[PDB]
Amino acid sequence: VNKLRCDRRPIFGKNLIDLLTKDRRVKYDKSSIIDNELIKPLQTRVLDN
Amino acid sequence: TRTAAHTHIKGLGLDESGVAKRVEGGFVGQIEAREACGVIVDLIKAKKMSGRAILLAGGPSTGKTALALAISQELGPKVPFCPLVGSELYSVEVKKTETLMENFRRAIGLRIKETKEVYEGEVTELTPEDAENPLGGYGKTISHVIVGLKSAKGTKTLRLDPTIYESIQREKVSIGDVIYIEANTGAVKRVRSDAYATEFDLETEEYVPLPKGEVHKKKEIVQDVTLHDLDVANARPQGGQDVISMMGQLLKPKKTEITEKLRQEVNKVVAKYIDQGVAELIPGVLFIDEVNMLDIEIFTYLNKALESNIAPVVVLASNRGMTTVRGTEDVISPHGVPPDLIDRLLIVRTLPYDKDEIRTIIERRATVERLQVESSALDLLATMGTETSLRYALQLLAPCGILAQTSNRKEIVVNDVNEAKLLFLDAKRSTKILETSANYL
Amino acid sequence: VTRTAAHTHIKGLGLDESGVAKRVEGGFVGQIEAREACGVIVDLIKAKKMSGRAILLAGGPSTGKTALALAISQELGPKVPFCPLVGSELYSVEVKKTETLMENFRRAIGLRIKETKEVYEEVTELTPEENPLGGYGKTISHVIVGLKSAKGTKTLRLDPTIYESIQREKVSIGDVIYIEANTGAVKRVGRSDAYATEFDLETEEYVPLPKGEVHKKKEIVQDVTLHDLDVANARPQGGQDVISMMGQLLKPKKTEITEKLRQEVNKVVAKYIDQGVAELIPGVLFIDEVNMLDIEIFTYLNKALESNIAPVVVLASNRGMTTVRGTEDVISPHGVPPDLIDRLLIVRTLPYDKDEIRTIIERRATVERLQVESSALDLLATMGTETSLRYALQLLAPCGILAQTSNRKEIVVNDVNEAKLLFLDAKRSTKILETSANY
Amino acid sequence: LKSLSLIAAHSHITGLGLDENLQPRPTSEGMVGQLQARRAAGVILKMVQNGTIAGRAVLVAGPPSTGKTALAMGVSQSLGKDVPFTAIAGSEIFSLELSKTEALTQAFRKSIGIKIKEETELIEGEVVEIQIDTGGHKQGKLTIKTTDMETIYELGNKMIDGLTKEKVLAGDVISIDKASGKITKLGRSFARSRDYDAMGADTRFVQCPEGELQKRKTVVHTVSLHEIDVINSRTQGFLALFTGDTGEIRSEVRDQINTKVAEWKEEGKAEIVPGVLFIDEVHMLDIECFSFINRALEDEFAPIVMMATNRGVSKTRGTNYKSPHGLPLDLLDRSIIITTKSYNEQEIKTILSIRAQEEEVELSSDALDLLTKTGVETSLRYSSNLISVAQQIAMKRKNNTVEVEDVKRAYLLFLDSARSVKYVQENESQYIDDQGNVQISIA
Amino acid sequence: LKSLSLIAAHSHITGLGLDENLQPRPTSEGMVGQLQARRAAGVILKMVQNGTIAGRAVLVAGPPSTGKTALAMGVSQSLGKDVPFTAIAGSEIFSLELSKTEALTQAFRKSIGIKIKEETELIEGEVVEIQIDRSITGGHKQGKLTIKTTDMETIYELGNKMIDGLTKEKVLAGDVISIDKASGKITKLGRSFAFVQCPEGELQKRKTVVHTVSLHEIDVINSRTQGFLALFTGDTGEIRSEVRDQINTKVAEWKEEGKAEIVPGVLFIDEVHMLDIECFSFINRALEDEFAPIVMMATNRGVSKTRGTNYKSPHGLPLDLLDRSIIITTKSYNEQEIKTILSIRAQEEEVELSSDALDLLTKTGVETSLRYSSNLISVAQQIAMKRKNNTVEVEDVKRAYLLFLDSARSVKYVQENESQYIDDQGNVQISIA
Ligand SMILES: Nc1ncnc2c1ncn2[C@@H]1O[C@H](COP(=O)(O)OP(=O)(O)O)[C@@H](O)[C@H]1O
Ligand SMILES: Nc1ncnc2c1ncn2[C@@H]1O[C@H](COP(=O)(O)OP(=O)(O)O)[C@@H](O)[C@H]1O
Ligand SMILES: Nc1ncnc2c1ncn2[C@@H]1O[C@H](COP(=O)(O)OP(=O)(O)O)[C@@H](O)[C@H]1O
Ligand SMILES: Nc1ncnc2c1ncn2[C@@H]1O[C@H](COP(=O)(O)OP(=O)(O)O)[C@@H](O)[C@H]1O
Ligand SMILES: [Mg+2]
């Protein structure tokens, strides 16, 4: 069980979740008030047509 | 502070009435080309024409790309500016025509600027106001909701339409933590606070400080988007657990040839919005260097594309003489550009340099690289540039500085440049070595 | 009732202890120098020191190059990997040829790993479970399970998680299961055989009871290749959500495996090797008709060979001074660019002679279980020396069929003549092709 | 021996053999001769280590088997780790999923890395023995113990709502951040090892952490620009860092990443480490690739580009004309050329001795002299392989040292290129001709 | 109303400029000269507007900068909206995900419109009262409203989906609302008080709406369940033939019964000289279909080599396609015509020109190409504006002429400085000494 634990514990990730969350963060909080009409994702287009 | 073949170029060094100074903005010589590019810049800033094409031609190492970079710098970061090498249009995923159209549309920009009224602050208290029912009834009737807001230096209580109650109910507003409401559209957004942050032993709820200034706020927000972003956002889906989202996530969504209908819809809605004064159009610049690598099909499609009414201004760079156009074998044209397209654009010449101009160029480049050279080596460097090439002399500066620093010196001398000549060769001496050797060299 | 295909009459290099090649041993005849060189090469491969050595065999058609390579593979042994390929096999459609070449390059070196595991194996009884005394709405502290096995029974206590795993397996009380305490996974082997005839029918196979001690300590040794680890990391099979399994549903197409993944795999393998858990064993990559390779793959071979864990590559070619395919004005020997042949070693294969051809025909007849006459064998040898060595070996079988038809067990001269008249060779077909109007 | 190399083609080289005044020593660190090229490579190494110069094209030119790849490997080794060094060949550019320019851009982005720092605070050592009994699971308190600290923390509604999910057995070392994030399970104390007889697949026994409960740490990660682009391209792009199917990342992502990196560097949270992009056999590459490089070399985020070629006045791929080194004059203009010369007899002997020392082969004096003679008449790599072949020959003979007889046997057992060419010329009929005419029949 | 646009190359022309009996005026609607070509274009426009003849191919041939593209643009402008006009280039057919025949079929089908009329009921007015009752923890809600016009005033009570439909867009007592019974779609016409006049007339009304869609869109919709998305993402591959075969018959029955009406359009192919022989053969076969629009192809090549072959043919097209085509030829421009073209182009860009400057521009467009002077107009105006005088003089025109080179001067400079540039063999001389 000692060897099992010593093998199980070191399973570190090559790219940690913290690193990718830091890299994928957005520095701008809120903007784009009039953008629910210019964008119009086609999921809404399916209903509109 | 990293320098790479540029960053000593800051504008065209122009002047009022459009006359170029001999030495200004990191530029020496090339007066006529700089004046023509300034006229082009003025035409761009006019924002009236569409699809105007200029091609600037000349020999290698004559400042052909520097001129385009200078006009991009003069135009300012606000306007779009799309650089492109002629070999990038050949994409495995999509046909070259659609890639050209995508880069063509990416140069057109749109600025969205609008104002918003905000009541943001820390909730003091909130209470419904009971009132007589408008109709016959037996029960409490709320006609207003009183909400008090306190921020740095400001405090104010407001009476609001009771129907907004659900907005609080959905927002889990609580009392005294945060609040941030829009004025006219209604609804509420919950942005805890530092006032009670240390009060609890530990909590997984974020805290924000007291908002600064008066509770009532006028905010002007401006952003810029290229039309290509609008097209790609309209075409691409978004959302959560919908089947289309799973399909997109599981398929590695390579680029697709966006239909013309979506582009027309985007154009119509954008025109409607700019009719209301909330949006503005900003034509940009599409710079393509080494156009000799373009195929004849791309040239033919460019012929039609330049005649559209939403085309940007396209500038092209080439350094070829009488050459056969790629994709054919019997058409020989100037600059490797078919005559029909040549008839559609304006040529801008570009002349080589003189020895004194080369010396000034080398001195300026040495100054921008944090190096000290006296005339006794600067003259030798100028002679090297006139003998081998200008770019060779420009490249040889850094090894000379490193060699000087190795000998615990500060100033570049004749010995350092001679040693750099011995160590690093130019093209001519390399070819001479190749020809005189017969050992697969 | 054993099948044969142009081989299986060779089973080694026929070398003594000192490396001297006997004239007729291991199915080979002649080719003493080539056999000695190949034995030296296989000794170097067994030395397990070098990395990236390259051997190329040169000779005319039907001279023994492929036989030599197969003899090397047989001499090496089943454990050491031996990846054979044809030159045209690299031109894939799903992925670029360089990626396929690298994948086959990594498929050649192997790794033997070992791991020691404990296991428990008839279920007697099980009890699930204390007071919450906190935020536990439903508490199952521990589960007691008893197993019977054959060499005595035993009971034990185990975590709630393995109990939920058992419930996922949904085993009964009179069953035999397979629980591996390393991963905490239970596998239902099945019902108990002695619990049969409870009902007149039962779909599930009853399966006998496990033999020996219930608590088994054991060790396992497996041989894999670095390409297996690369594939496992590139396309993991784990996952329970919709996305993972639906990705498993799509066809597996080769991609461009990154260099970083290979570097990390190498680091992990080196770390495990330093502990003595596993050991690596380089193999051999064999390529036929390298003249089918173009200049791009030939150039990439220079970079691949000078790597750090490159295996031993053996190349075959029968061309002379030819243009390297992919370029139009590069005359090179064997259709291999000058730098590559500068990077490798050359082994020449000599053409056979009449007596060697006769002995080869006799050996093929013996390994094919056929009876021939001395005069018939002499005629066959003269025929082979007149047209080709392969022609007689191919023509041997129809002669046997014709002999069997007339209830005669021995190949004779008239059967050989009839086979000659019935079946033509390349020379006669060429001589009768142009002497006609219609092609 | 951290790497998995058994013995490389050139593994005896560990950096350039030069000194403080950049003068190359005659033989050190596995390099012999090539003093001028070594000095130029040392100057290049100083330039790249300086980090104030972007986008330089240096081209190493010389006849085959003169040390170009060896020189680049020495430069990479002397540069040390922590600095990216992307080594590729020309033939790898042509891909079936990405265009040539896209692959070149990805290589350029991989060539330069960034160090990004991150400051964080954690709480560790949650050996608790919780105390929760009003209504709705009131009494929100729990203890926290470690080697030097011990204290009781009250709880809020959201904290207990987070705690009930991912239940803590009140005896397991757990971690939690004050960033209003998620409490992370770490492990179990050693006191609960004997309790069961078969642990699960997610339970480990970690010792009690020592020190203080509220720890603050800075962590620095080294990430290439290409990795950032890949991560930000898709929803889960990090997997494409292993599978490799990135699929022609668009320019908007690249410019957004450029702005983000500029902001990070301005705020002091990150710093850029430039690297070196090395290209073996640059002679075989399309005119489109050179056309793209001509402009990609001028970017601010451009590494130092080293190229290797061994061709004379040859035809450039994708064209009809012949140019020196198989490169257009436009690209050759914006580069500096380091030329390697042929090798001397004494240098060949020293290289052979070094390579034999690397393989633990004991050569006789006459054996080494004969090997040097053969490597002078023929190529050097032929003798370099002959040393190992002769070592195997001698080992088969039960003799540690290699003698002249073993070397001669190896020479007559494996054929040099010239002898094979002569044999092919003398026996043209037996081999398949360029027109597919062969004479299989011996008579 | 006007869509996004700027000053394009052909923004000054609006229609062919004809008389009532197809007689072309010398200068009208932005078109100057080329009377024969204009009358032929008018005849083709009448052919298209009649809507009886199908699958006619007409070829416009002439030297560069003559007016064929302008002729096609004028035809499209005079045809007006609601009539499809699909303009493509010769190089757009080549694709990596669609075969040449498939792309040509899509281009052909994109230029035929189908219009379906339907009748919709509406109830429009100003909201007078609204009472709404939500049962908390209850699954049903009780609604009622009172809606009036200038003449009528009536109350209604609502079901289930009416309440939520009214609540997603906040409806108050000061609003003007229009309701479609069939779809239940909310439409806010404005708040009367608390800038729109109160709705008048009857409380309910009827109207007709036309849905117009291309035949290619109908084809795409029925190909696959997800094919609707391909209407925007443009990702549809090789629609099966039976789909088109069935859709043609279905459209035929719809037209015969009277539900819908079809409108043929025009397919314009610019730079048609470059196209594979496969595309030419496919066009030869597909021109004969009954559901084929009028095809207008433009070319400027002489006896040139047709792509995909090794022999030269007139106009770059095979004789097979030329046999079943009608050719309209365009001729060069007189000096007076060039002056008029320059004048109208300058008038379009709101640029004031001097008479002597206009004459010099005419001379330089006679010696060089016309497009050169047309382009020079704007840069001359920019120079004049930078000189602070809002009038283009001869000096500004000469400054622009010397600053911006011409093709002939550039060719002469290259020929006399050959060593400066890179030749066809890749040999260049960068060193001055
Ligand atoms: N007038 C100038 N002022 C400053 N730098 C110049 C000037 N002319 C040329 N250069 C230098 O020449 C280089 C530009 O070369 P360029 O002529 O653009 O090559 P190509 O024409 O092949 O694109 C730049 O590094 C720039 O420093
Ligand atoms: N020395 C040999 N002893 C026995 N059989 C041989 C010998 N040389 C060649 N052969 C036989 O000749 C047959 C064909 O030769 P092969 O190796 O296919 O020629 P190639 O080298 O052109 O591929 C093989 O089946 C092999 O068994
Ligand atoms: N100065 C040197 N020091 C050590 N080894 C060298 C040196 N020069 C060449 N070599 C040997 O030559 C080989 C490299 O040959 P190289 O010149 O790189 O071939 P190519 O020119 O085809 O790339 C290596 O195996 C190395 O052992
Ligand atoms: N009759 C005309 N009326 C107005 N403008 C014309 C006329 N003919 C040619 N042009 C102008 O000449 C330019 C060249 O267009 P055109 O000749 O139609 O295309 P192409 O050069 O492909 O033949 C256009 O910008 C157009 O405005
Ligand atoms: Mg340039």
Ligand SMILES: [Mg+2]
């Ligand atoms: Mg073979």
Ligand SMILES: [Mg+2]
């Ligand atoms: Mg090399």
Ligand SMILES: [Mg+2]
């Ligand atoms: Mg036209």
